[PDB]
């Protein structure tokens, strides 16, 4: 799509978050 944004935004959050949910959900909707 020629209209997508081709820029980088250097001030995006450069850090990782160890305190993020490390588990997965088997109960999430498997359909779409």
């Amino acid at each position, epitope marked *: 799509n020629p209209n997508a944004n081709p820029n980088a935004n250097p001030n995006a959050n450069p850090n990782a978050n160890p305190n993020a949910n490390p*588990n997965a959900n088997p*109960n999430a*909707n*498997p*359909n779409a």
Partner: antibody
Amino acid sequence: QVQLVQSGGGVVQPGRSLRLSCVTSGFTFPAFGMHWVRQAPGKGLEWVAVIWYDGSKKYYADSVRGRFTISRDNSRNTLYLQMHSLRAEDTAVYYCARVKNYESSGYSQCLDYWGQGVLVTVAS
Amino acid sequence: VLTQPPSVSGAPGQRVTISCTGSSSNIGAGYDVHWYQQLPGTAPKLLIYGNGNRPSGVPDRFSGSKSGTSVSLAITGLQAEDEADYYCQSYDSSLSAFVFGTGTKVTV
């Protein structure tokens, strides 16, 4: 209109592999997630495996993990459960079930349409 | 993991109720419990889903409700066509695996 037909049962000696299949018709197969449910003879139902619509994410029960493998051939409306190292406890009727599309606050996957039921016997 | 009475009974025409007791992570966590009807042979079919929502084709004699950490399946009429095994199903967050009940036989 909806239909789930199964095949692949029989008697398998312990330690040998076996593959079950579930051919579907009457609905858009790629758009639905699917389960396998095992019913020991005279016991209650229990869960075996679930596969997402595209097949990216799969989750197995504890007692079948590392031996069983669930997969789908999305281009010809069929679902598989590949069983390896079949032990003596993996004897039951295996049902192929489809995850129903519904929305609720406390959503938990429900299986609206079920396969016919295939018997797998492990003996001798 | 979900506990149900071994069996229930009643004269035809009367009402019966099947219970399904779960822990704080199965039903107390807010997860819906679905019920399946299993005739001999005859792979089980969805009976009620999401704490009592009836799918199309199920007679109005079947209903359900949620109360605390256990639910119930109220059957009215109790006809000979209801002779079957009824199983719960819900998701256990502590195990992160779908849980089926021990199942109850309705003998009428």
